[PDB]
Amino acid sequence: GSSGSSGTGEKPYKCNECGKVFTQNSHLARHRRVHTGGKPSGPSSG
Numbered sequence: 001g002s003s004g005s006s007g008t009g010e011k012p013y014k015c016n017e018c019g020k021v022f023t024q025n026s027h028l029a030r031h032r033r034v035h036t037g038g039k040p041s042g043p044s045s046g
């Protein structure tokens with residue numbers, strides 16, 4: 001039944017917001033921004 005899909009995270013740096021991984025820390029610290037500040041798909045604006 002429930003199998004433990006392997007190959008999920010090969011680095012100590014992982015975003016605790018969405019669930020992503022990075023090879024470095026700077027990439028993780030900067031990535032976080034995508035959350036606090038970001039405009040994903042949505043309605044039409046100007």
Ligand SMILES: [Zn+2]
Binds near residue numbers: 017018032
């Ligand atoms: Zn994230």
